[PDB]
Structure formats: structure tokens, C-alpha cells
Amino acid sequence: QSIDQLIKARGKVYFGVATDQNRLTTGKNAAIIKADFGMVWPENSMQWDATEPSQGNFNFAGADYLVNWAQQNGKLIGGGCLVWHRHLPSWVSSITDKNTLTNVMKNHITTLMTRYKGKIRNWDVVGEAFNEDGSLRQTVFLNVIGEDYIPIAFQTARAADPNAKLYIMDYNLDSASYPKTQAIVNRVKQWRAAGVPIDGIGSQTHLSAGQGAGVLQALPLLASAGTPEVSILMLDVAGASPTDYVNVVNACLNVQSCVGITVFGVADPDSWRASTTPLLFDGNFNPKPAYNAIVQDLQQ
Amino acid sequence: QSIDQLIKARGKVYFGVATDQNRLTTGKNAAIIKADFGMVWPENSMQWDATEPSQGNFNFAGADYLVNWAQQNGKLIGGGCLVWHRHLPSWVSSITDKNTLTNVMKNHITTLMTRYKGKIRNWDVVGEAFNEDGSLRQTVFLNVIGEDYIPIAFQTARAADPNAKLYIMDYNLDSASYPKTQAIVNRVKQWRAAGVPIDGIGSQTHLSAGQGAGVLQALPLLASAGTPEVSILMLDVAGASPTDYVNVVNACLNVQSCVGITVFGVADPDSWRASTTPLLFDGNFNPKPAYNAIVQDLQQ
């Protein structure tokens, strides 16, 4: 049974997955995505080092492949991450002039979003902007532009494609009593009160065994920032316990503004932490107990 | 034991594998390649549709990642395929002018080879140029430029990087009685006698169960064309029988000019034909019996 169909029947938008061209041409990934998932995200093909490896000179072949495949197969598309420190070519992080970096950042945002205008439901505009203690992470963007880089990024994105839902994303937002969770709420409330067009908070949910239960309290806390949407992004769970996965799904169901869940790949051997077997399909592309538990939870 | 180390001890150059960036950042692929393989080959990041999706718009982020990784980890690198009718963008196949297509082909070859000059041991310059009956395949290059496109491609490649071994590659060269196998031998002989710089024939070896034995006769036939080198390229075997894999390895050992073997990926779930489980590691990244049989054969 399709978990995307079942989550749509419960009033949500999607159950999605990260993928890219060489996943769609190998394994059983394309067949599983066609049958069971409703949204695709680029695993790597829209990151900055993949798309703008020298200034103004874009690499779109990989991203175009994904967008085309999704349109042919009737899937929604997400995109990201537009502004991020972790996937950033050296030419960017070596700029020291505020005006120049602002224009580089706006050109990167506008070029990607314009190319796919109207085709992308969600964009992750800014990612991993917070330290664990809730202060802003001192990346090249913060150091050179200042905290205004976040408002500027979102304003620029809204102008490039008004159809898209604009997200900030981060990880370690999985516990309601962890400082980073309340900090992103505090700052997103302030930014929205200043008119910054942040439509969503995306929680990049990488859990250890037993941590699913805490998402039931963390996700409603994230929703208290008042964004129109929240999502669970790039979900995986070490051990892939049915209990952990069902708890995350039920947190989504319990939060009215949570539109859906994306998992960080199809099958365990293709995970960035494969030894923890953290996904919903095994190395032979069979659905694991957690997959079947999600099916039953969405019916029950 | 490392099959690359063992094949080197038998006088060969490499046991290699196809890979690309997202493979290296997921699963156990990087650890296995470091320990057990001596050469990497882009699974897709150097094809024409990946590298020049529109005229003059080169996309090298993926290929650059692979080349860097290989240099940092002391691995040989192969590249290709430069001229091929598969993976060719529509902008190329819609050219009807002989001078224009000649210069487009030259520029594609020269740009890729120049970027990595000195770093790439082997380039597959022309691929899949023959029909199954041994006549030349009527691709856009044959139709518009004529038969001299093959001499031109090789002469352009030799000028771009004289350090590289230049290969022609094809598939279904696995039986000595098949017309294609004899045809490529005859044509390569005559091209080399006329000074065309073809250094190698690469046999793209995609086998069904039981076909390994035929390679013991086919590979010597390919070597009779007199090229400095031959190789086994992108090897996989439906069912991954030890008998089939050992027969292919022994064909390599028996042919003095065969420099090595590349396998078409690490683990079964990442194969283009994963349901046939045709690789040397399983979906849990454990060596399969075929891996251990190769080790035993090479020790003896």
C-alpha cells in the first residue's frame, strides 16, 4: 500500500523522498517512488556546489533531470537548499565585501528559482542557520552581511517565485526542551512580525533509537511560531524501529499545520548512515516492518 | 583481501569500479573502494548529457568531485565516454552541417580532456560505433561527418592529452564467433596501420549466466588487433556466479595486453539491473562468493 495515498486520505499533502538521477536509473527506486511516494526532493543536485561551482556559471543538468521525471510521473517537487554553509564552494566563502556577497546570494536564489518557476512546491531557502545553543551560526553570510542575510534571502525568494512555499530548515529540533528548538521559534516569530515571508519550518529529523516519542512534543512547539506550514524533512531513524517511525507520523497527524514528511532515501544501503539501517526499505528493496507499521497507523 | 592488490601482483594494472559522488557519500562504497579497488570510473558524470547539456554550457561539478577524491586516495582514474550516441543531448543530434558537428565534437573532446590533462589514465573516446552485424552504426556522427569521424576523434584526443591511453569501446564482444567481435578487430587493425592513435579496445562486458567461459576465447581475439592494451569494462554478471566471474578474470590473466578489469558498481542494490544481483557485494555490503572466488584464483 502507498503511504503517500494513505497520508493524503488523512488530510496531509505528501509523503516524499530524496532522490536524484542515478537513483532513478538503478535499483528499484523509480518503481517504489512511482507507487508509494508523492513528492521528490533532490538529494544533491540543487545544492550550491552542484549548481554554481563558479560565479554565475550554473550546472543544471542533474536538477533538470529530476524535475522532468517528477512532472512526467505526476509527483510534487521540493528544492533546496539555497543558502547553506555546508555545501558551499570556496569562491563564495572567500568574499569579504557585503554588497558583493549580497548580490551573489540574491543571484543564486533568483536564478535557481526562476528556472523552475511554478514547478516547485517548497523551497528550503536557508538551512542550518542556528548553533546548538540557539545563537546564529557564524557562517560567511552572517559574518559578512550580518543577520539581515535571512530577511534578504526570503524577500528575494518570494519575488522570484510567489507560488512557492518558502522554508527555513534545521536539525536537532527534535526535543521541546532543547535550546535550539525554542530559539528557532523565537526568531521565526520575530522575522514574521517584521513581514519576512517565512512560510514554513522544516525539521531535518535524524533520530537515534527511542527519539521518536519526543517529536510528539517538539513538532507542536515548532508550530507555535505561527508559520502557515511545518514539515518533517529528510527523516531517518537508526534501527528503523516501528515505534519511532509511528511516533513521528503521529506527530505530523497531530499538528494541523504539518503538511507532510520526507524520508532521506528509499533503501538502507543508499543511506548516509547505512550501517544503522535507518530507512523503510531493506537492501533487497523489501518494505521493512516500519513501513508496514506506518500503513497500519494511517489506516487505524 | 584486496582484489586490486592481488591482480597487481599478477602483473596487471588495476581492478577498478564505476562510482560517482553520491556513492562515495553513502553506503560503504568509499571504504570498499579505498581498500579493494585501484581505479575509479565515472558511472555517469562524464557522459555528454551530464557534461554539456546545452552547447558550451559545461557541467563539471560531479566529475571534479570524483577526480579530486581519486587523487586524494591514490587511485587511478578512467573517463568517458566522449563520443557516443547514447546519453547525447538533442542539441547535438539535430545538427546537420558537417563542419559544425566536427567542431562541436572536437570542442567536447578537447574541453573535457584538457580540464583533466595528465590525471586520467584511460579515456573511452568512441563508444558503441558498431552494429551487431559488424557494420558501422548509423549515428549522427557517421551520417553527418562520415567514417572519418573516428580518425578525427582519436587524433583530436591524442592532441588534447598525449599522456592518456585512448580506447574504443563496445558491447557484445563476448564471443569469438559473433560478427561484431571480428568486425571491430578488422577495423581497428586497419585504422592503426594508417596511424590512427587507438591505444586500446575496451569490452563493455554485461553477461548472462554461463557466458563467462566465452570471454576466454573472445578476449584473445580482441587482442589480435594489435592495440597496446585491451580491457574489460563495466563488468557485471546476472546471478554473479563464481564460475562466470573467475572465467572473466582468467581471460584477463591469459591475455598479455589486457591491463585490467572494471566492475559496474560495488553493491547489488546500486546496479542498473539490481534484480539480477550481478555484482561482487550484496545489499548488506558483504562480499559475495564470487568476490572470494576471485581472491582464491588470484592467489594461486
Numbering used by the authors:
A (entry chain A), B (entry chain B): 4 to 303
Quote the paper:
HG3.17 was evolved from HG3, a higher-activity mutant (S265T) of the in silico design HG2 that was engineered post-design to reduce the active-site conformational heterogeneity observed by molecular dynamics analysis of HG25. Over an evolutionary trajectory that yielded the HG3.3b, HG3.7, and HG3.14 intermediates, a total of 17 mutations were introduced into HG3 to produce HG3.17, resulting in a catalytic efficiency increase of approximately three orders of magnitude. To evaluate changes to the HG3 conformational ensemble along its evolutionary trajectory, we solved room-temperature (277 K) X-ray crystal structures of all HG-series Kemp eliminases, both in the presence and absence of bound 6NT.
One of the key active-site mutations occurred at position 50, which was mutated twice during evolution, first from lysine to histidine (HG3 to HG3.3b) and then from histidine to glutamine (HG3.3b to HG3.7), resulting in a novel catalytic residue ideally positioned for stabilizing negative charge buildup on the phenolic oxygen at the transition state. In all enzymes except for HG3.17, the unbound state is never pre-organized for catalysis as both Trp44 and Met237 adopt conformations that would prevent productive binding of 6NT. In addition, the His50 and Gln50 catalytic residues in HG3.3b and HG3.7, respectively, adopt a low-occupancy, catalytically non-productive conformation in the unbound state that cannot interact favorably with 6NT. Interestingly, the non-productive conformation of Gln50 in the HG3.7 unbound state (26% occupancy) cannot stabilize the cis peptide bond formed by residues 83 and 84 via a hydrogen bonding interaction, and accordingly, the trans peptide conformation is also observed in this structure (25% occupancy). From HG3.7 to HG3.17, no further changes in catalytic residues occurred during evolution. Yet, catalytic efficiency increased by approximately fivefold.
